[PDB]
Amino acid sequence: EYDADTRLQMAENAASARKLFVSSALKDIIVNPENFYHDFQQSAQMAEDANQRRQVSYNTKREA
Amino acid sequence: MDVLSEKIWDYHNKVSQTDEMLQRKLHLRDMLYTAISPVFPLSGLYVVGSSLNGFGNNSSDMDLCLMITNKDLDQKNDAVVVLNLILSTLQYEKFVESQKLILAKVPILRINFAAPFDDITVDLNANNSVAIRNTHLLCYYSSYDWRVRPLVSVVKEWAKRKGINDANKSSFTSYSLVLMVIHFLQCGPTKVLPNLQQSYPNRFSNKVDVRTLNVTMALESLSEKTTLGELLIGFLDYYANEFNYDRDAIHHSISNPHFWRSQWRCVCIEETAHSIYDEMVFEAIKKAFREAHGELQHNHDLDKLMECEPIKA
Ligand SMILES: [Cl-]
């Protein structure tokens, strides 16, 4: 990670380059980030999950 | 299986998202997350749309949502700062070839790539969490019944060839077709799908924290076992009627602003000007829905249906 100091400065650079501003809410996200990491959508799990479905629904016969 | 249902299922397995394509896309996501996370630590990068909603037809497009906060993120200013900061970051990644910041109600970073990923185009938004909730919802509709998925594949392919799903902005999006099928399977003559939002409000609401969403968790009429071919035939018949469309906003002119892009958006979790041209195109689409119904009902031949002439608009 870049430290909070660095990331806040990067954001301020990103804003002023488009005549925008770093809001209080965005500064808060940078200083104290909330953990939204995609724990439940990781590639290996997703790839296997989707391959389980294709594999089940074709080489399992349904009688109805 | 009857011949029509068999040809539908076979077509489905041939045009649906392949394992290889999905793996490439997920890898690309992880590569993008590795480059982005130093600038937004503890953030999430979620796949949304057809790539992971259970209805993928191997399109080179991929939509991503970067989650950084549990509140709504202001899209006019803050989302643009975020996306601009990401644009600056990805300029130094050599696997990224070009970028474009697209301003809209929900601003988008469009990314193109070098290496063996140059066929894939990525659209990235900043914390538009409704896209994740709806990807999650559609994924459970896609696995509620074994008929939903092959019934979406052929329709997508038919609409594409028929010109009902087109590049020209006066046509239904792929996403609209999915909602149209689901709406049909919910409100049509044969009740195939319930309203998941009403049956499981705590799981499929908009108040739902996207961090608690996990598609690997399979959670719990049915005299119904009408065939796949009969569902397709009924679908075409259903939208042969103007009163079955989402025409009105909250002569039935196309008053609904979301008509083309999000037909029957009330199926999903809730997130300008039409002309006489849109109406004309809509009229043509109804006629196509009437032709293809007469065709398939008479022959039950998916191939003849599939080599249809495109619509004129
Ligand atoms: Cl879709």
PDB file of C-alpha atoms in Angstrom, chain B residues 20 35 49 74 88 120 141 148 196 240 249 257 299 310:
ATOM      1  CA  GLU B  20     -11.800 -20.457 -21.074  1.00  0.00           C
ATOM      2  CA  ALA B  35      -2.694  -2.513  -9.918  1.00  0.00           C
ATOM      3  CA  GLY B  49     -23.349  -7.951 -15.753  1.00  0.00           C
ATOM      4  CA  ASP B  74     -21.499  10.935  -5.261  1.00  0.00           C
ATOM      5  CA  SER B  88      -3.468   7.849 -13.858  1.00  0.00           C
ATOM      6  CA  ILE B 120     -11.662  -7.711 -24.045  1.00  0.00           C
ATOM      7  CA  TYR B 141     -32.917 -16.599 -11.250  1.00  0.00           C
ATOM      8  CA  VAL B 148     -34.249 -20.310 -17.569  1.00  0.00           C
ATOM      9  CA  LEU B 196     -37.376 -13.389  -5.316  1.00  0.00           C
ATOM     10  CA  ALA B 240     -46.445 -10.075 -29.548  1.00  0.00           C
ATOM     11  CA  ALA B 249     -43.231   6.241 -17.058  1.00  0.00           C
ATOM     12  CA  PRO B 257     -37.213   6.559 -20.226  1.00  0.00           C
ATOM     13  CA  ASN B 299     -42.480 -25.667 -37.750  1.00  0.00           C
ATOM     14  CA  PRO B 310     -32.954  -8.695 -39.775  1.00  0.00           C
TER      15      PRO B 310
END
